[PDB]
Swiss-Prot record, chain A:
Originating species: Homo sapiens (Human)
Effect of F425S: Found in a cutaneous malignant melanoma sample; somatic mutation
Disulphide-bonded residues: C54-C287, C395-C421, C402-C422
Name of the protein in question: Glutamate receptor ionotropic, NMDA 2A
Binding site for Zn(2+): H11, H95, E233, D249
Effect of mutating T497M: In FESD; decreased protein abundance; decreased localization to the cell membrane; changed glutamate-gated calcium ion channel activity characterized by affected receptor kinetics
Effect of R484H: In FESD; decreased protein abundance; decreased localization to the cell membrane; affects glutamate-gated calcium ion channel activity and alters the duration of channel open and closed states
Curated annotation (Swiss-Prot), chain B:
Topological region Extracellular: 1-475
Gene Ontology cellular component terms for the protein in this record: cell surface; cytoplasm; dendrite; dendritic spine; endoplasmic reticulum membrane; excitatory synapse; monoatomic ion channel complex; neuron projection
Protein name as annotated: Glutamate receptor ionotropic, NMDA 1
Disease linked to the protein: Neurodevelopmental disorder with or without hyperkinetic movements and seizures, autosomal dominant: An autosomal dominant neurodevelopmental disorder characterized by severe intellectual disability and developmental delay, absent speech, muscular hypotonia, dyskinesia, and hyperkinetic movements. Cortical blindness, cerebral atrophy, and seizures are present in some patients.
Gene designation: GRIN1
Subunit structure: Heterotetramer; the NMDAR subunits are modular and harbor tiered domains that function in concert to regulate opening and closing of the cation-selective ion channel pore. Forms heterotetrameric channels composed of two GluN1/zeta subunits (GRIN1), and two identical GluN2/epsilon subunits (GRIN2A, GRIN2B, GRIN2C or GRIN2D) or GluN3 subunits (GRIN3A or GRIN3B) (in vitro). Can also form heterotetrameric channels that contain at least two GluN1 subunits and at least two different GluN2 subunits (or a combination of one GluN2 and one GluN3 subunits) (in vitro).
Length: 504, 475
């Protein structure tokens, strides 16, 4: 019947009136005369809350609430408790401080928010560690109120995993402005992927320290969620390439699209009211009196917000008000330090990415030349290629993923780089060389030719990848021929061979 | 310079006590230009409002800190959320004076709210001191499922597993459990009779009825009680000899006024020694920015020590609750509380008034009483357990070994259709083998009886996942 809307100063008010008119003419044509009152502000201010909220509660007892701000203060969504409990009116938090979920939803809270759902944050962070097989960790949080929760999430959800994630401990920076104790605790990072759970200014501090620690090198990786990114409109300076956040931002969406979605959620809750009741518990009158009690005898939307579906998208909510099928726009910073679309989680909470493994790409450079393109043939038992095993991850005990060029058709020969599991002699040898020569090795497979073909001396296979430097390194079961030694240098023989004859 | 400090009471005579303590603060060790003006507000008749005086009158007068009582009735659901969190927009520190609701002790949501009176979950640690005086190992825990209750569970389980002491049962409740009798019959099944209680008043009173009702009130049935259940009708249906707690200087709030004004005054004179003292915002309009010295307020309040308090040393935990506040342990005797236990915070002082344990004598009981009845389930493995049927009598036969020796046989309750998804019928079935010989040797040398069963699964059982694909459970 009535929905109130308070926003950050953004896309305008008559625009939202047109959005409401389009949502009304769209679908589910509402026997309830839904009427919406919207405003644009910039305040984190409780007298503004008193004026706007109490004057709209005086006016016709407004029943719906939508809040997308241009703010970042987390406790605002925690201060929505007194609206949820001193009006008992359901609240929708899309952007701004209303998005910032740190309020574990009370039985007196009437919270439903499009904000960064915490349990789903932990699971999506772990599936990000899955989908590029970054099993080796380093964990740095702080002791902001509510991070011990995330410590419990990481510990339990790794211990509930049979994957066996390589654990480096949660390095909790105690207080700010230590600046010597923090450097002692951050010289304890001795792995590649660094997982941060901090504020924004502390992230400025930690990146300023780690650019001195050498931890911001660009073979390291940095997956830092929406606690630090927040507004993608704000891009501060010390935040390099390869910073990976998970946020419900309007890259994939707009403001008014989520407006119409959330109003539709409220109208399906109101239709379930009109199913199970035929009347509605009205909103309160004033902020300045308590007439009889707070007896919710007509049973507000918490069983009615359980089942919400719209337009092929389940906009239903869990018991703690989080999204059953969430959106979860995964956004990675690049060379230009631009917040760009990478991952999605809308299809059964499964990842939808670009298959781009390398993202730290010389923003605050840190050049590194250690990656050895080793493109060999499938040579049993030197090279034995398996496929991806569904063993709760893509991690088999003796394998390396190797990106084949799987061509689409004969006319469309686009070789999709399909990672496939890899074993054999030479891969055990490259593991031995990662243990002795200790560098990184890039495994792919040969499609054009096998070893080398003098097609007017235009080499194919292994030698075609060596001469034209496709495979800078090439191992194989390569016969060191005199003709091949004319063209390509060779190492020591490591397996004795020659020509033999097989007979019965 | 001018520091405005608020106070939420119900009276104004103790607000004048705050004013005279502010005069003392201007006199004592804190001097001298002008730095204090008086603000003090009673409780409001409308619990919706609760911030009118705060923004219009306190934040407009730039109040740094407010000292808050419970309510004007102090016993309804009006335990002080709203003034605290309406001060908690911009991360302003608030000291709860006598609050014991450990919901407020949760730092994760209650951001900057510290107490001169610690809640009951700190009292959980106190019961561990009972352990080291009274030598227990088998523990009965009873928790109404509360955020207070689960936080106290967390403190209990940490302080158990630090000393490797192991509780037996944690039975769980809501505030309002009256059919406790099933959980009471579960509670009849233990060596332990050590009863640790955490629920509301009428919960306790009905339990003192139903358990007494069980009988379950005999010597050994020791009632370890939180102070909420030392109020109301939980008082009026409890038996005698019950160990209860009392926080010393919990109710004389004038001593809390004197201590709190001394603490906050020298905390302000620690604040004024720092740098970049940000200006307190007048308006709750246009001030779109949280405090910067908010964490500097926290670093002042956590690191300041006040040994010269009326209640003792006013020095805090890492919860902002006071360390080494004086404890006493009391005993309803003819429903009259009798002093036994005294603690500085940790130092055990049993009074000469004896502990009649709340059933029989003054003898320290035992939650250790064996039954010599051993629940055994036996895996269907021959020759270890030959699982054959019994007679038509349900009894085993009269057979012999190869040596002509009559076999030690065991009637074993177990399913017929020993497969999952089948009609399983618990039938007495004869059992034969090694382990029966072993157990009867141990019956002779050890004096135990044995309660032998068959496996419904026919399996050992490993850690496997239940649905939601993470639940690693032993099967």
């Amino acid at each position: 019947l009535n929905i109130a809307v308070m926003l950050g100063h953004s896309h305008d008010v008559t625009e939202r009136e047109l959005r409401t008119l389009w949502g009304p003419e769209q679908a589910a044509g509402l026997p309830l005369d839904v009427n919406v009152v919207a405003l644009l502000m910039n305040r984190t201010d409780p007298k503004s809350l008193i004026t706007h909220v109490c004057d709209l509660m005086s006016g016709a007892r407004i029943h719906g609430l939508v809040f997308g701000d241009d703010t970042d203060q987390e406790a605002v969504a925690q201060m929505l408790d007194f609206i949820s409990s001193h009006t008992f009116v359901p609240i929708l938090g899309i952007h701004g401080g209303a998005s910032m979920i740190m309020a574990d939803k009370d039985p007196t809270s009437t919270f439903f928010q499009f904000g960064a759902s915490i349990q789903q944050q932990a699971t999506v962070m772990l599936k990000i560690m899955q989908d590029y097989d970054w099993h080796v960790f380093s964990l740095v949080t702080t002791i902001f109120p509510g991070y011990r929760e995330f410590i419990s999430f990481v510990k339990t959800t790794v211990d509930n995993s049979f994957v066996g994630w390589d654990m480096q401990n949660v390095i909790t920076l105690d207080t700010s402005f230590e600046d010597a104790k923090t450097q002692v605790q951050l010289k304890k990072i001795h792995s590649s992927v660094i997982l941060l759970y901090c504020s924004k200014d502390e992230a400025v501090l930690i990146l300023s320290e780690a650019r001195s620690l050498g931890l911001t090198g660009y073979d390291f990786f940095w997956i830092v969620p929406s606690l630090v990114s927040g507004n993608t409109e704000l891009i501060p300076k010390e935040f390099p390439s390869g910073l990976i956040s998970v946020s419900y931002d309007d890259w994939d969406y707009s403001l008014e699209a989520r407006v119409r979605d959330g109003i539709g959620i409220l109208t399906t809750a109101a239709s379930s009211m009109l199913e199970k009741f035929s009347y509605i518990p009205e909103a309160k009158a004033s902020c300045y009196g308590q007439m009889e009690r707070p007896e919710v005898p007509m049973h507000t939307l918490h069983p009615f917000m359980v089942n919400v579906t719209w337009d092929g998208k389940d906009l239903s909510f869990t018991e703690e008000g989080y999204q059953v099928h969430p959106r979860l726009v995964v956004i990675v910073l690049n060379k230009d330090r631009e917040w760009e679309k990478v991952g999605k989680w809308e299809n059964h909470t499964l990842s939808l990415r670009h298959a781009v493994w390398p993202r730290y790409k010389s923003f605050s450079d840190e050049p590194d030349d250690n990656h050895l393109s080793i493109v060999t043939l499938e040579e049993a038992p030197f090279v034995i290629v398996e496929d991806i095993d569904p063993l709760t991850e893509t991690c088999v005990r003796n394998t390396v993923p190797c990106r084949k060029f799987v061509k689409i058709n004969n006319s469309t020969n686009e070789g999709m780089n399909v990672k496939k599991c890899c074993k054999g002699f030479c891969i055990d040898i490259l593991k031995k060389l990662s243990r002795t020569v200790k560098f990184t090795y890039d495994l792919y497979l040969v499609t054009n030719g096998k070893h080398g073909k003098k097609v007017n001396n235009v080499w194919n296979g292994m030698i075609g990848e060596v001469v034209y430097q496709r495979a800078v390194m090439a191992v194989g079961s390569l016969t060191i021929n005199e003709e091949r030694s004319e063209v390509v240098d060779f190492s020591v023989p490591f397996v004795e061979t020659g020509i033999s004859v097989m007979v019965s | 310079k001018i520091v405005n400090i608020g106070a939420v009471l119900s009276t104004r005579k103790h607000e004048q006590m705050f004013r005279e303590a502010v005069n003392q603060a201007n006199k004592r060790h804190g001097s001298w230009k002008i730095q204090l003006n008086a603000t003090s507000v009673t409780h409001k008749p409308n619990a919706i409002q609760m911030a009118l005086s705060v923004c219009e009158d306190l934040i407009s007068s730039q109040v740094y800190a407010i000292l808050v009582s419970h309510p004007p009735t102090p016993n309804d659901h009006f335990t002080p959320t709203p003034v605290s969190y309406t001060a908690g927009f911009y991360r302003i520190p608030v000291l709860g004076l006598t609050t014991r609701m450990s919901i407020y002790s949760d730092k994760s949501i209650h951001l900057s709210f510290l107490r001169t009176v610690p809640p009951y979950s700190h009292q959980s640690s106190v019961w561990f001191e009972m352990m080291r005086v009274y030598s227990w190992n088998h523990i009965i825990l009873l928790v109404s499922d509360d955020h207070e209750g689960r936080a106290a569970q967390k403190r209990l389980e940490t302080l158990l597993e630090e000393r490797e002491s192991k509780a037996e049962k944690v039975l769980q409740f809501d505030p309002g459990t009256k059919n406790v009798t099933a959980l009471l019959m579960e509670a009849k099944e233990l060596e332990a009779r050590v009863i640790i209680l955490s629920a509301s008043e009428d919960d306790a009173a009905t339990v003192y009825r139903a358990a007494a009702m069980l009988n379950m009130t005999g010597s050994g049935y020791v009632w370890l009680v939180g102070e909420r259940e030392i109020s109301g009708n939980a008082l009026r249906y409890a038996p005698d000899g019950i160990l209860g707690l009392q926080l010393i200087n919990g109710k004389n709030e004038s001593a809390h006024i004197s201590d709190a004004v001394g603490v906050v005054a020298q905390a302000v004179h620690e604040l004024l020694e720092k740098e970049n003292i940000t200006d307190p915002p007048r308006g709750c309009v246009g001030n779109t920015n949280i405090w910067k010295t908010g964490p500097l307020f926290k670093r002042v309040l956590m690191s300041s020590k006040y040994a010269d308090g009326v209640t003792g040393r006013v020095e805090f935990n890492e919860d902002g609750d006071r360390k080494f506040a004086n404890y006493s342990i009391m005993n309803l005797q003819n429903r009259k509380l009798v002093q036994v236990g005294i603690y500085n915070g940790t130092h055990v002082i049993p009074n000469d008034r004896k502990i009649i344990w709340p059933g029989g004598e003054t003898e320290k009981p035992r939650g250790y009483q064996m039954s010599t009845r051993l629940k055994i389930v036996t895996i269907h493995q021959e020759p270890f357990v030959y699982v054959k049927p019994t007679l038509s009598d349900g009894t085993c036969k009269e057979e012999f070994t190869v040596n002509g020796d009559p076999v030690k046989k065991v009637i074993c309750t177990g399913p017929n259709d020993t497969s999952p998804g089948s009609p399983r019928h618990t039938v007495p079935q004869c059992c034969y083998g090694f382990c029966i010989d072993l157990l009867i040797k141990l019956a002779r040398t050890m004096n135990f009886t044995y309660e032998v069963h068959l496996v419904a699964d026919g399996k050992f059982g490993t850690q496997e996942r239940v649905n939601n694909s993470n639940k690693k459970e032993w099967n």
